[PDB]
Design a protein around this ligand. Structure first.
Ligand SMILES: CCCCCCCCCCCCCCCC
Ligand SMILES: CCCCCCCCCCCC
Ligand SMILES: CCCCCCCCCCCC
Ligand SMILES: CCCCCCCCCCCC
Ligand SMILES: CCCCCCCC
Ligand SMILES: CCCCCCCC
Ligand SMILES: CCCCCCCC
Ligand SMILES: CCCCCCCC
Ligand SMILES: CCCCCCCC
Ligand SMILES: CCCCC
Ligand SMILES: CCCCC
Ligand SMILES: [K+]
Ligand SMILES: [K+]
Lengths: 274, 251
């Protein structure tokens, strides 16, 4: 346990980075959202105190219980209303295959989750089998797309061969054209599809794309204009293969910037200003 | 040359088709039952209080739907819960940022935090893989001398011991028996539908994520086996079915 003592040292130092990284992230979000929280929730009270004055003969003390039972309904697919009390299935022939696609990709929006105990015991096994299953598809799609990218770069790697185009530095031009194409084909072009057909802004589509393809976790949901749902699960498959490489390159960038800063502090703790 | 991805593609498509037909068979019954009882509870309430009516109540539903998008959240802790979701990609959509700056931050915060957290989880996986490597070394002497199949007893003790330390024992810290195991699997498969109480719970995640990371990879190894086992099995069956057609030609 000589290198294993050197392992725990490296892990513990990373642990404190993630902790602080999460502390930085926390303080940033609460500085950006709790302003927008208080604003809406000072106006949710105005709408309560509006509607209790507007209709006093409703049960004040039991109205919140009506609100809670609507919120307790919200977790399941509910759009309860008198005009069009007749409704449509969130577990129809397709929306359950949307759901299955979420579970194996581990995207899992949680927009709809199974309520049956048979659906839970199936989903557990369906995930424990589907997640590794989908992995080998995604890996093959990554290799399939990595050789497609390997084909296109070979032609680009001959178009501008000048005198001693430095081998170490050509690899940077190649990774620039990767991010350039990739963040058009899997970020830009499909996101603009989610702006005319779903009704979003420019950010909210790119935000949607990153949240989904970073498998954090809807395109099938909002409806403006059945050619549209089968194709999106192909962009997901290849886009997930894309960010898988994108997140992995960023990981490689973080190794570099770890050792460069690790040796840098090494010299500054050596010299102490001459 | 040989693609071999297309063949997998059709399995996943087929697997998703089976899974789909199973879920609607399990949920659309439990869907109709609820939503016929939701209409009864509404048609009770409109009759129980004529003070409220159709044209009022829909406005009450809309202002709850308008509330849904927001709902103290985002407090000093609930934003670091949120950040913990984004880097682990568990990402419970329980709370999501509404500000344009919170979205542009979250994008970059994920693009940087997900790989970052990966190296933590990787080291925790190696740290826990040698801890598991310690425990097996002593088990590999207590009865391995006494009377390829030993490797199964070891992986049985893995599932046995790990699905107590990371599923059963923690389960409450965080219902019923199912609802805890369902919770554990959903969370640690990253699907996600010295002082205060906060720090210790978040390390169960870290080590439990390292646990299912090995569990899911082990299952991947069994799928690779069962792929080759069935790959060669059809291999023989097409050999005999051809020689079967060949004999009726000669004889
Ligand atoms: C092994 C070659 C991979 C093919 C993927 C590139 C697609 C190029 C688009 C034009 C050709 C469409 C072929 C459709 C294949 C079902
Ligand atoms: C709730 C259903 C999941 C039970 C998992 C049991 C695992 C048994 C493994 C046997 C492999 C041959
Ligand atoms: C890697 C080169 C593949 C070229 C395939 C052609 C696709 C159509 C491009 C249209 C250019 C006008
Ligand atoms: C009912 C079993 C579901 C698994 C999918 C069938 C496995 C065989 C696929 C064909 C492989 C060559
Ligand atoms: C979020 C940036 C943190 C930088 C860590 C440097 C500590 C040596
Ligand atoms: C904000 C830049 C993150 C890089 C951190 C490096 C940790 C060694
Ligand atoms: C809106 C532009 C996002 C910039 C991403 C940078 C990640 C390193
Ligand atoms: C690189 C993954 C190997 C998959 C096994 C395929 C052997 C025919
Ligand atoms: C050829 C792939 C076989 C997949 C078997 C899956 C069993 C759950
Ligand atoms: C809930 C029993 C399992 C069905 C596949
Ligand atoms: C080296 C690329 C940085 C993009 C923000
Ligand atoms: K995930
Ligand atoms: K997720």
């Amino acid at each position: 346990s000589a290198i294993n003592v050197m392992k725990w040292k490296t892990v513990s130092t990373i642990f404190l980075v993630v902790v602080l990284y999460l502390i930085i992230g926390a303080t940033v979000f609460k500085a950006l959202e709790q302003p927008q929280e208080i604003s809406q929730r000072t106006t949710i009270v105005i709408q309560r105190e509006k509607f209790l004055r507007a209709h006093p003969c409703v049960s004040d003390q039991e109205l919140d219980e009506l609100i809670q039972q609507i919120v307790a309904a919200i977790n399941a697919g509910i759009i309860p209303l008198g005009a069009s009390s007749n409704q449509v299935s969130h577990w129809d022939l397709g929306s359950s295959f949307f759901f299955a696609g979420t579970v194996i990709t581990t995207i899992g929006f949680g927009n709809i989750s199974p309520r049956t105990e048979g659906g839970k015991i199936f989903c557990i096994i369906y995930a424990l089998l589907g997640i590794p299953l989908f992995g080998f598809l995604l890996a093959g799609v990554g290799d399939q797309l990595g050789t497609i990218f390997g084909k296109g770069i070979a032609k680009v790697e001959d178009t501008f061969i000048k005198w001693n185009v430095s081998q170490t530095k050509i690899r940077i031009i190649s990774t620039i054209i990767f991010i350039l194409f990739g963040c058009v084909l899997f970020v830009a072009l499909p996101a603009v599809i989610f702006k005319h057909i779903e009704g979003w802004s420019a950010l909210d589509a790119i935000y949607f794309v990153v949240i989904t393809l970073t498998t954090i976790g809807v395109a099938g949901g909002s409806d403006i204009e059945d050619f549209y749902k089968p194709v999106v699960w192909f962009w997901i498959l290849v886009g997930l293969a894309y960010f898988a490489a994108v997140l992995s390159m960023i990981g490689d960038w973080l190794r570099v910037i770890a050792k460069k800063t690790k040796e840098a502090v090494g010299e500054f703790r050596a010299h102490a200003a001459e």
